[PDB]
Amino acid sequence: ANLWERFCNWVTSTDNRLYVGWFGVIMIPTLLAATICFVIAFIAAPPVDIDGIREPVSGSLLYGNNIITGAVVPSSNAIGLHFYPIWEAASLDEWLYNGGPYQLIIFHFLLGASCYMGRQWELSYRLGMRPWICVAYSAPLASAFAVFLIYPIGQGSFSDGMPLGISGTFNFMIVFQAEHNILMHPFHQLGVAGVFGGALFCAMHGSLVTSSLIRETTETESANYGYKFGQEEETYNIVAAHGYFGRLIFQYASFNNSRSLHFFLAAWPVVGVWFAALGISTMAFNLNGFNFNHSVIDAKGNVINTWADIINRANLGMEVMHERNAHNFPLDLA
Amino acid sequence: KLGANVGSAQGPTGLGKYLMRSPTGEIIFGGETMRFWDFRGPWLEPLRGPNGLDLNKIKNDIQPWQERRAAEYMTHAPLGSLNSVGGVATEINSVNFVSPRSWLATSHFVLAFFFLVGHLWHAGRARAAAAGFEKGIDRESEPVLSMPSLD
Amino acid sequence: IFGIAFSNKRWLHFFMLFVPVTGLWMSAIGVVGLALNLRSYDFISQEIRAAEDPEFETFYTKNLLLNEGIRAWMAPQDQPHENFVFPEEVLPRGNAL
Amino acid sequence: MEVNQLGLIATALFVLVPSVFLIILYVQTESQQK
């Protein structure tokens, strides 16, 4: 065999402890670069001028953060959507001041995660499985793209991408509410139904299967020892599971087809999360949540407030305070 | 018009309130709009010279048509709600406006996204079907059962 | 793909119960604290540094400014029984907005 | 940063005590007649 043929055989081998694959060839170096830069920046990066106003924000542990407050901070508003690799900087000091790590991290991460999704297709093909696990992963992948790429594009700056940190994520969420009234957007509402529903059906399915395990163990043993990896027979009684759930609601509300059941478990959170991602990705172009501010008016013309108007008051607080030194003109237009 | 010397007006942060430099030195508008200095449009280019925005042209040459256009475009920024209340998210009801640009960008992002998913769905399926396992794993011939253990 | 996998179907299904059930229970404990205003509102070390050092800023201090906006702008209409009147001049606001 | 002077011991014992409990249990399971 050729040197190239042996290598292709190794790359695509079903017997590597971790599958490599052609997507893997791009995924591995890009994820490693993103990870290494993330960890060093989260520990040791100096403050970053995120809003391009020479007001640098400290994200790293060594510069006074803890796990909760720390972040890799987004690149400068002065940069906008300009591509800012290390070699476009005069020095590493400049690159650090201006939030260069954030760009390096997000772009390698998004490439490496896109290749993760391809890799899931690829291994399924090598193993003779059906191909759509990668389709379920496209839901969280699309959401990462929404916050790190599509939102910045729409708003004209990576300074508005989600920060890589826990408190920074909350900052992103609060400003987003103020600027898009995302709570009042039906795609975010579908997102919530997707993740609350996902959690509800997760608990439901787990409890129903666990409820109907076939007795294979004594009282002093974990029931988990009643199942052996790779056994042919099913380990629970789906008829008993269905008999319980059908009576809990009514017979027709219950699945006794395990394939339909497992399809539903996939589809509900995946579709809801696609809609969450499309919420962020379309609020990116400022088509925003429902606005019922002063929608209700009395016979004279007095505004009669509703809960929408109370939401609006909270949003105003967020709006007027955020980036308190950045706006010189009366409208925040991006 | 009120008398401000816009070229020398320092804003709260130290950057120019109206005018500042891009990272490569061009004179550009200040405030958050520093991110939008790549923008080019016919109402604005008359004010631009080799250095960027030209303070002399700004002082002497801004026509009323340019003023009109800037006011019109500022007040038709592509922000508005799903029910077509134009303005920022805290705006009161009054103006029925969502920009055609927001309509067309949002719709096509949504369509382009679902089309990527359709691509993955059909590409995966066409590989599985061409190889003969799109209906599931042959119980009598399960490929993984013939592979060595990982560990 | 991921380095680890379930091998035990019973454990897999018990974990599906465990995860979201435990999460909701933890969130409930936090809300029982909030009943008493026993919040995780602040990090004291952050506030001591920020008070002494006007160039020190983190996402944590940025969020508190947003909270202060929320309380001042929302409280008069949201808590009518308080009869709050906050003159324009006392409202926290950044530049221009 | 003027952190709480008990935060280090609290974190350390938080980690150590339950981790040691699990390690004790795991090793004595391994040493059982297989």
Partner: peptide, 30 residues
């Protein structure tokens, strides 16, 4: 001291990932 603590815990977690993947209890069909 806090930074050391946070990085230590993090480092231990990465160590755990390594042992959990490469020194796992191997899945065996019986």
């Amino acid at each position: 001291m806090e930074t050391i603590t946070y990085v230590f815990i993090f480092a231990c977690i990465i160590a755990l990932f390594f042992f959990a993947i490469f020194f796992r209890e191997p899945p065996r069909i019986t």
